[PDB]
Design a protein around this nucleic acid. Sequence first.
RNA 1: AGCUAGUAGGUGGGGUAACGGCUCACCUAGGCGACGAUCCCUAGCUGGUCUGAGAGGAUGACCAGCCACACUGGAACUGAGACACGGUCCAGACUCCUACGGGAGGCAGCAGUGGGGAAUAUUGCACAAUGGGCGCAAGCCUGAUGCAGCCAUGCCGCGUGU
RNA 2: CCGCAGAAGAAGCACCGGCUAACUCCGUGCCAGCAGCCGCGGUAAUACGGAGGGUGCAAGCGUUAAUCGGAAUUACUGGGCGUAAAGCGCACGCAGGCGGUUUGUUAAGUCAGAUGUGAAAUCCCCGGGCUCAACCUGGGAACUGCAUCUGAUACUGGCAAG
RNA 3: GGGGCUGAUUCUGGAUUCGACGGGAUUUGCGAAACCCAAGGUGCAUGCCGAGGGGCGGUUGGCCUCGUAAAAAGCCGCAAAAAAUAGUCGC
Lengths: 146, 371, 205
Amino acid sequence: IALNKRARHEYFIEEEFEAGLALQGWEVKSLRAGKANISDSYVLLRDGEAFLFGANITPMAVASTHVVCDPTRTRKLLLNQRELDSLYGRVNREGYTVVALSLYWKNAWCKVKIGVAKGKKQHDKRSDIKEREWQVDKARIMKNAH
Amino acid sequence: SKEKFERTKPHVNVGTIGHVDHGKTTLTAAITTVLAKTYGNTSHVEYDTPTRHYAHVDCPGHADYVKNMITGAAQMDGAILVVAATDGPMPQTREHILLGRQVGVPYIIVFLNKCDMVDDEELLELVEMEVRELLSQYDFPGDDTPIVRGSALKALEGDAEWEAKILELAGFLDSYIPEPERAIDKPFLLPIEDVFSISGRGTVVTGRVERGIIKVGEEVEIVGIKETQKSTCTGVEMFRKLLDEGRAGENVGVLLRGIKREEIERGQVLAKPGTIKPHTKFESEVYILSKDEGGRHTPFFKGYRPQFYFRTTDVTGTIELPEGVEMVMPGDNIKMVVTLIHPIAMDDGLRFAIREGGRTVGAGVVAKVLS
Amino acid sequence: ARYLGPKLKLSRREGTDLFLKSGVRAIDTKCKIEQAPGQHGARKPRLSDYGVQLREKQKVRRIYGVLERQFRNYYKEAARLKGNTGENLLALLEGRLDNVVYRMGFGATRAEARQLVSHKAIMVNGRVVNIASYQVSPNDVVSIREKAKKQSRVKAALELAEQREKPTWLEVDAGKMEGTFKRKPERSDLSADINEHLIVELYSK
RNA sequence: AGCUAGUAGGUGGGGUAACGGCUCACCUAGGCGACGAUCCCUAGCUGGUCUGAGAGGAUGACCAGCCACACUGGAACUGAGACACGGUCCAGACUCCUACGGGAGGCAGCAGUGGGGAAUAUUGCACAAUGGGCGCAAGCCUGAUGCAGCCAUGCCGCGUGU
RNA sequence: CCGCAGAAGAAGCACCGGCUAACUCCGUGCCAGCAGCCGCGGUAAUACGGAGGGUGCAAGCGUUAAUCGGAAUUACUGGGCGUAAAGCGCACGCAGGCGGUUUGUUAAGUCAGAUGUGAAAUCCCCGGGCUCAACCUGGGAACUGCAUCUGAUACUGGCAAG
RNA sequence: GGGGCUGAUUCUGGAUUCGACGGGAUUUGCGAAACCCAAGGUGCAUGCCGAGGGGCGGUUGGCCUCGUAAAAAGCCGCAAAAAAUAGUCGC
Ligand SMILES: C/C=C\C=C\[C@@H]1O[C@](O)([C@H](CC)C(=O)NC/C=C\C=C(/C)[C@@H](OC)[C@@H](C)[C@@H]2O[C@H](/C=C/C=C/C=C(\C)C(=O)c3c(O)cc[nH]c3=O)[C@H](O)[C@@H]2O)[C@H](O)[C@H](O)C1(C)C
Ligand SMILES: Nc1nc2c(ncn2[C@@H]2O[C@H](COP(=O)(O)OP(=O)(O)O)[C@@H](O)[C@H]2O)c(=O)[nH]1
Ligand SMILES: [Mg+2]
Ligand SMILES: [Mg+2]
Ligand SMILES: [Mg+2]
Ligand SMILES: [Mg+2]
Ligand SMILES: [Mg+2]
Ligand SMILES: [Mg+2]
Ligand SMILES: [Mg+2]
Ligand SMILES: [Mg+2]
Ligand SMILES: [Mg+2]
């Protein structure tokens, strides 16, 4: 189902729809089988209706033994005109960040099940920052040694 | 490796690329037997004519073997069109003559088998006139070419008339093929075409010396696909005979030390050190015509992926053109930049062949190198 | 492989009277030399330990022109010998032929002395040598061959030699370009700008 | 955790260049073993080398002494000196040649080739010096040896400049 | 070795947050990515990629493979067993280990002296020659071992007395 | 060097791929580049030059310029007597 265990354990998905994406023959024919790496896809704002970002291509042996197929290749999300400016505004002033979740199939199209997830806050690093400050203070206070 | 070869009667290469199952192997075997009697896959037999020493290459006439046949004909200095006089010209023969003209074989001699299988004196003349007309229309020489009729398998049967006929055939072959030009001016260079592994001896690489000489004990450099390395030659030989130096223009086998059969493949060149460097992209001018020079008809566009055949082998390549040409429609006398996957040691002025779908599209001459 | 490259930056990295270039062209604290004032100039992070010892080893090596491996070989020989390891090491460093030429004055700089020794501008006991690592024994004489006499190279070096003080063990005449090396130096005569037991501690580590 | 009955010993013969169950016939029923017998796995040993202040630990690269081996195994002869490293016989595998009547072979020697590997050499020159064996001796030969080639594989020194 | 034109023909690698010698910027933004550990990297990375600049070695620099050291972390020199790992559930007892006090006698353990020996090679010390060195070589010591001859009788032990 | 073989989905006998790429039928809610005239006035006007001219020093008969008679002036600037940054901040 490609549940995206990261987005499951953190910031439960809230909104999603069904759409495909554009890709070349190199990074295709393996999503039909199912192999992929779509864990925490970092989809950000793109002028072309938020082109798909973050998720890489499956490491299946379709390589020409130079690269897998494409270390970085353009991936396009699909939306007529509904979420370019609205997505920009939501990311700016709401806290909801759209990420790709799963890869469902119409038996032909590898659908981008992008989910609009909430930006969850980082863990309290207010102990390790002080630990690092004490470490650098210890490294600096070694002056009076001859 | 037990005969000390004498560099007399300069080596000349003659190749039979005649019709399939029309007696090419039988003809070359008969020629060798009659010459060795009266004088005392690519099959490379040899024979010493009183005029010049010739190496006869029986090439495969099959269409699917055209890739190695390209080197066999580029290797070749004189072509022998071996065809049956009872069937006349064939599509395979036309393809072979087109390939020979595209690779640049100057001198061609036509031989008509099954002379005695026809009890007439007009059909042989009719088929000879037909093949002569074909040559004259396909940009080949004409009435100044020795045309040879006769049986190719009875030349080995006990006779005298056909033996004299085939001796006369060898005579004008050596007459019509004069002393060829050799290019021993620049440092040594030899493109590889075949690899053998001699037990107790090592790895040997076969090919026609493009330029320069090779003395026994000389250092040479392997330059080619994915690899540029160094090595040492020990025991220059030719047709299982002892040699001292290897001139340019003859097919010889050079013994290399510290060579792996799987590591060294066909396509590379044994050059003198510091002479040539492999490249993957280079600029070249193309010479395609409008429609009647192999090139396609429809106006194709960029992204074309043809095979760029070279002295040794070929590789799929991509072409990019400067601005000012929206389309790359046939009729391309312009210059463009060709990028290849496998690097091959190349120099300016190199002539390569552009092919696709089993047919030649156009020619190209290397103009500059972009590495 | 003698060191080659910048020298003022090399000296200001540590900050000492290591030695300078033979020619002088405004050698002073004009604006920024070793303790650069103005808007910056952090000179010493003040490292706790083993750092000053590493700096001492490096400054010793760059002054004498010796490499790390040869310097460690000299240290091992000094430790194997009797006496004090530091003074034995300094004795070997001074007995290196290039420093002998430099302290005799025929070498304007230590690098220049090494260059001359390599180019055979020096001879020992009436025999040429082209090794800057040769060790001279006491009561010996080292001469300059007739070919090196005509060098503005050497003329400037001998001119600059007499502006400094003179050592306890070298007596050199420039009328024949010859110097007698009588005894071996000690820590008392050697410049007291470095500590030897810290270096001993470092490579004994 | 038991092993061994030619096994422990003696009496005589034979055998060995010499002692001796080495072997034979008889008799005695012992011998070895908890300090590890018997059996299994691994392993060339030593002078030495590395790491260590030391006792210790690892290992046997180069070289030297000794042992064993020469496709696997068995056996004997010549020869003072072998169960023989470029002597002989035979069983087995492999390879090669044959005229298909029948024969040859064992690079763990110098090189060199195929395979393995992270990975390692030229099918050189010379008896010029030492040594080796043969010979009145000059003199023969020696892949021992010495020199040559490649590799920065390790140590040392010099140089790219003042 | 002598002459010949000209520096003219000859420098790279690793690292730069603490261990450890070395600081700034740009971009990505638990992503891409570094690493031996501590541990980094969630818009401001001296730690990631690049750039600038510094440091450590240098025709050699880093990763990996194996031994020892630090590991007193198999500890005899030189650990511990109530709660961290560790006193058998308890008792008897053989082989085994040790053993109260005094005398005599044995020389076994132990100690001393002397001899031969510990191959050469190698470590080390004093010197010498290769431009010093690497390397080679002379002499010396050492190789703490082993066996033999004679003494010592305090201690452990054999024997005889209490 | 050649032969066989795998290069999606039931060898797809159709996907607007709702959004990607040159641009487009259809009506227009648009002005010259989506689509022409100059239907309100306005001649100092449709429309052309071999060409000749500034404040210290040069000039691309001109990116300045004339209704082309030969004149009213732009672009570079610090080198000299110039406004040289009165030579090097004697600025
Ligand atoms: C053929 C592939 C391999 C060749 C290898 C290389 O070719 C070459 O690079 C070569 C460069 C000259 C090359 O690229 N050849 C490879 C590629 C290019 C082809 C070359 C030459 C041509 O010119 C455009 C060549 C045919 C040319 O046509 C002229 C006359 C036309 C003949 C008729 C046939 C043709 C075509 C034709 O379409 C035709 C027709 O019109 C009527 C009926 N039926 C036909 O079928 C004349 O005969 C010239 O010879 C060099 O020869 C090298 O030495 C090489 C051997 C390494
Ligand atoms: N009757 C006849 N047969 C011929 C003659 N020349 C060749 N052949 C036949 O050609 C055959 C040899 O063909 P081959 O050379 O092996 O085929 P290729 O290598 O493709 O040309 C033989 O079996 C002959 O029977 C001829 O002059 N007369
Ligand atoms: Mg007996
Ligand atoms: Mg073994
Ligand atoms: Mg043999
Ligand atoms: Mg220890
Ligand atoms: Mg220990
Ligand atoms: Mg403990
Ligand atoms: Mg416990
Ligand atoms: Mg208890
Ligand atoms: Mg219990």
